[PDB]
Design a protein around this nucleic acid. Sequence first.
RNA 1: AUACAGUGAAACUGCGAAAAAUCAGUUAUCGUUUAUUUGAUAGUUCCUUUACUACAUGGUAUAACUGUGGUAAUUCUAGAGCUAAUACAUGCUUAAAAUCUCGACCCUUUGGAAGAGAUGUAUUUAUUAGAGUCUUCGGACUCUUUGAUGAUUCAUAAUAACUUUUCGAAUCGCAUGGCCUUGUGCUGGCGAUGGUUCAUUCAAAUUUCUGCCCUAUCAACUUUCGAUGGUAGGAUAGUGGCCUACCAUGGUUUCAACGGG
Lengths: 297, 41, 247, 137, 148
Amino acid sequence: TYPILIRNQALIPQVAENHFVDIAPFVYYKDEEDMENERVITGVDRNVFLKTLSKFKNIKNVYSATELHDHLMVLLGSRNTDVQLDALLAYKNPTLNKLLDDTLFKDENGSQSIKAEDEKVVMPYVLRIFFGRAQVPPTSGQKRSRVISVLPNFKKPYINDRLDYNYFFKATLKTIRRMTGFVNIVNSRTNFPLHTNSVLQPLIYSIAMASTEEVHLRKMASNLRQQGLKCLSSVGNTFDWSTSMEDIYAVVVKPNLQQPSSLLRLYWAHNPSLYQFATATALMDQHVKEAVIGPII
Amino acid sequence: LVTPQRLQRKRHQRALKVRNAQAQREAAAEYAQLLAKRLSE
Amino acid sequence: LKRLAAPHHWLLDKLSGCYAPRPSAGPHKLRESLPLIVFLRNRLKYALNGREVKAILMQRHVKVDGKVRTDTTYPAGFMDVITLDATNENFRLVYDVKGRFAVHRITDEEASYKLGKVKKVQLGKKGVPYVVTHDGRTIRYPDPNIKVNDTVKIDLASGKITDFIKFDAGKLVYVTGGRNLGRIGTIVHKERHDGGFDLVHIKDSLDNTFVTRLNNVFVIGEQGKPYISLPKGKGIKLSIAEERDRR
Amino acid sequence: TVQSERAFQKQPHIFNNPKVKTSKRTKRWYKNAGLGFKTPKTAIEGSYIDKKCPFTGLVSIRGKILTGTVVSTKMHRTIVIRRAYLHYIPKYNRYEKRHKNVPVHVSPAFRVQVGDIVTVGQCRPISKTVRFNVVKV
Amino acid sequence: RKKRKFELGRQPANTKIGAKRIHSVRTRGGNKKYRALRIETGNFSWASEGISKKTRIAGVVYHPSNNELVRTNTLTKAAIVQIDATPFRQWFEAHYGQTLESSVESQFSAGRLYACISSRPGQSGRCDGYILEGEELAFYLRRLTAKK
RNA sequence: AUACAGUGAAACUGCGAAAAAUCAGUUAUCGUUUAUUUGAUAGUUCCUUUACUACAUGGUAUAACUGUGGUAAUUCUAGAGCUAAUACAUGCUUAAAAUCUCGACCCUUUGGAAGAGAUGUAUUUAUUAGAGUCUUCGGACUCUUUGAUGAUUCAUAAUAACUUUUCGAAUCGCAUGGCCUUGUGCUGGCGAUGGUUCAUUCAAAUUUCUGCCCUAUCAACUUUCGAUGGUAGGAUAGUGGCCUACCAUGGUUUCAACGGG
């Protein structure tokens, strides 16, 4: 496979083999072979239209097999710049794929590819890692300084992570999606992002009530971030459709969530809470109960 | 080359770091009880 | 390799070539330590020449305060122990009435530990209190009643502290350095200037009220019950003329 | 008058917050010099800057404590001290007289009189020739 | 280590804005220094609320020891610079809810603020400034009147 | 011994070759470096991870070597191809983490715990902290929370970021042991090197003051091209006109400054 990809790099019939490879690349040693095939393919018409979307996925993310390889991001950006003002955006995005001064300079398809390559090259680089903290803060600063950008960021989060049963009511991929939802809500399309985050938190709650510590920490961080998101937003229909099963499972447990119950009860919030109702149990069952009682009264 | 020796050495390095951290976080708790009894007297 | 004016309490022979050994970096200073060459070559005479001293150091026979320290120019200075495993020997090197490094033959149950004066108590990193001592054993987590110019009792199996002698007015004291070397007794007066030149004054059998610098003194224990043994009648320096008048 | 230069007179790492309020305008920093030298309230509540003050600046007094008398105040923010110590060399067989001169840094929190007795401390180098510091008259 | 000589110096860094370059320089005894040459970006921090951000520096408008450094746009310590004001404005809108002090709310809609350099990028390796606010803002508005 | 194994040319590497004028001392470094030795020192590098991953450990770029010559000599050389690492340059560290709180509840605690919460270092800033009773007569009942210095803006912790980046072991010789899930499965010792920070050590650096010949038919010297201070900066391991700007015009001296041997 590596020898054949080297021969294809050494290369009509090449375009027909590129159409067959476009089928195989729309479908899916494999890492080095994919690197060699991308370096060959970055140097049809409808196969080109599908490959532009596949290269946009590879320059927006490296999600499934790897996690945000910079060589993969460079090869995907070279393929996208070979596919498709444009020169200035290409130079800024090439310096970004090469990040500090580029983010300071870049602080509509160019904007789509810009959010793509920015969250690709800083797609959760690590937890701290002595530079990943600064990289995650830089990506959050660029996402807050660049409404279409935040809409596309929530769109990419939902594109990572059917939906009908997920709105009505894969453990390792669910843990990765829960970490993705925690990282997305870590920032300083609202209905679709809230629906996807509620579906991820509910699936994490189900798979945790059924790796277990990973699901526990991810569900705890996601529930605290969901309370923070509802407090920073402040629609009651989807709000009730999300809160119903969660507070029902947390009926006996409520004797994060208590701060959400005390922050969603202080006029219109009082109507939103009385739409559900429990509250006397939250009051009776300590400063953590004293603040809730002497505020909720 | 991965001989049996090198991964034994890596195993010993990892267990060395964990055991040093274990002894240090035992000594910290011991000093905490000592400061507790120094408070109590 | 600068020499022939050594610290002259080493008492090396002057017709022994030209030079004199350079103590390397270590737990003690230059002119108040004693390397193992000067120890095992012209202080107790177990080895004739310096390369034979290197042979007995390389063959793991000697350990200073717990571990081997295979090194000729190792400045094993004051108050430590030297546990020669062969000859069953525990050389504690302490001071004398005249200014030299007197030797002992310590029992094993006393050679199992050593002591030493602290130099500072600090907060090192991540809010961890650590003390130092005079021989560089910066050890963590003391009892925080440890004050400056005080002595701890290092366990020498681990580096822990077993006990400490919280010095104040009136607990038995040693001296080190200065022209009042090798004296004991702590109870006349306790002077405290601002910038040194102060002592806890001394009281002996002849009750000689003596002083020196506070850097030149450190503690041992309780009066009459010391933690370390002391050589040749627990050195006093009464008088040699009075000694030749009586005996 | 306080400001006398193109640059603002800064005492760094200590600054007020505008949203909080007090009648001090800056959390003004002061320190006791040591060796029994006591800071005066005129030096405390004087809003002078003095980045080289041995009560409120950056320098710390240590070691030598000399005496002297003022011989001149004809330099900008530095004063000159005389020391006419009694001197004797056995070639003379008499108590002969010399004099010793030195420049000493001075603070705006203290009056200066040509003739009075000043107690001077040793500090870090401050100028090409000024090494000492006034601490107390 | 650490000999002495009689009288000489060295060439300064006298850095500019545009085409940020950092050249390391050898220091005897650890802490290998970095001369910034023509650095175009810097770390700038609010004093009161306490938020830093890396920000494209616009230009130094005042120097208190040589007026020619403002002409050549030299970034030394303790100068008066304009930057961007937009990420601090973004944090202000985000976490105060005002969505806009008086003499800095008047500078927000003007666009660029004034700040003071505190690092020495001729020797250290980076540039930081804090946005002047309070009596520093008072005397530096008086220094703007000293400009005009 | 079908990777090598003790022996070792050569070479790469690592380390070391560093006439108050001189000085003899004295003082500080709360004004710098701190290599070597010695003692403590660090679980965090991928999780937009199930179309699941370099860590049972990934890459060049070359010596010695082989080959072609020059040349008048050799401690002179140019070309080419090989091949190594503690050289050079990257780089993930498997109950993805792991530990302490709160521990309600039980069952009796020396627990075991569902879930409410946090977690490196280094660099450069800006802060903040850093200062009278009840009495089983036995004891308890709440007590007034911080290290040192003569002295701190010290030590240190947290806070919000920036890191052209730091480190957080891709190394080596000896034995080969315990386990049972008999798999090249899990673990395991002695100690060589390297590295973060602090202390000690020596070594360097300035700086304090006490001290040397003959002199006034030697009394003025120095601001030029900073001579003397301030303020800010450049610099520098670092204070400091050591230099750069603006302000002030000083300083030394007849007690012999300055000069003469």
